[PDB]
Amino acid sequence: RVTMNEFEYLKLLGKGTFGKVILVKEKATGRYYAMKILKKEVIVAKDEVAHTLTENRVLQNSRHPFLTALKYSFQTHDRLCFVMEYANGGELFFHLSRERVFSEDRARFYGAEIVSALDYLHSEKNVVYRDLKLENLMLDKDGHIKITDFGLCKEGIKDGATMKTFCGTPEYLAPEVLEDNDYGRAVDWWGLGVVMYEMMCGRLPFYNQDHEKLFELILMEEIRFPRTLGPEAKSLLSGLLKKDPKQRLGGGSEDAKEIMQHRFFAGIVWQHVYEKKLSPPFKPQVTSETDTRYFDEEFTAQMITITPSMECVDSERRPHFPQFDYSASS
Length: 330
Ligand SMILES: CC(C)NC[C@@H](C(=O)N1CCN(c2ncnc3c2[C@H](C)C[C@H]3O)CC1)c1ccc(Cl)cc1
Prior knowledge:
One of its GO terms (molecular function) is protein serine/threonine kinase inhibitor activity. By secondary structure, the protein is α+β, with helices and mostly antiparallel strands. The chain folds into two domains: 1-90 and 286-324, Phosphorylase Kinase, domain 1 (2-Layer Sandwich), CATH 3.30.200.20; 91-285, Transferase(Phosphotransferase) domain 1 (Transferase(Phosphotransferase), domain 1, Orthogonal Bundle), CATH 1.10.510. It is 31% helix and 15% strand. A six-stranded antiparallel beta sheet has the order 1-2-3-5-4-8. Strands 6-7 form a two-stranded antiparallel ribbon. The chain is globular. It binds the ligand CC(C)NC[C@@H](C(=O)N1CCN(c2ncnc3c2[C@H](C)C[C@H]3O)CC1)c1ccc(Cl)cc1. Ligand 0RF is lined by residues 13-16, 18-21, 34, 36, 68, 84-87, 91, 135, 138, 146, 148. Residues 13-16, 18-21, 34, 36, 68, 84-87, 91, 135, 138, 146, 148 line the site of the ligand CC(C)NC[C@@H](C(=O)N1CCN(c2ncnc3c2[C@H](C)C[C@H]3O)CC1)c1ccc(Cl)cc1.
């Protein structure tokens, strides 16, 4: 039976719109985790309840080498706590920022891992991820991808079933989402297109600081590439960033298999991707189990405290949530 008292709170790893993530040590075991901490009050007030419960569900129901693994979820009278594996390599942005562009080989390696994870979610879990953006990609201590943040997932989506919720970050929205006339699972391949584009090209495929103008570009503007980009990369990215999901790579009944067989991935053995038999091109150079070199000092410098008999309280501002009683089976 796990509570807040079972952990030592070490360093702030980041803050998002709805809460914060702390590097913790489980005292009993000496193991290190990233604890995501949400205020019930804030979740309720910002209408983030449904997303939070979706994230909780999808984490409990999924086991994949490239999806962040949940160890515990539990709740206090005022908090919801996700204890997850600590992705020691930080956010991919940290790296991509600094290096400007990844090589095609390194993007290919990350792209394959992301395809592997999305194929599992689509094929095995009937889940559409919907939130594929650079910010949701981290690296584990070995340099393998971890997709994080499952709040915008859609469950129970089998084959060609459609969704209609308008959601996702403005720069990353697929044309059919902006059309707002229903969309399907190929929205994830649009997202793979955008992140692989950022990795290889060093910038978003489409950008304007005005959203109306950004949305016009996403919908209408043909993709362009820096002229150093190799032909196969350009072919992959053009196929992923087709405006019409029916013409998009991965947009047909074969889903991920169409992307897996693209010649950009020639020579990749997909079972070996899954088994982590491809050596990462970058290994995080962390020197301890608590090294936070791949996290922003803006966050890690900050002080941590217990806030910034109530076991059964179930109020409107602070509900007693279902399924926050989770400890992964050993
Ligand atoms: C660019 C910035 C806005 N990014 C915000 C982002 C962030 O700073 N992050 C860094 C810390 N952070 C993580 N840090 C380490 N390991 C892990 C995570 C995930 C919880 C999954 C787990 O393997 C989460 C991502 C974030 C996301 C959600 C919350 Cl609640 C708090 C922070």
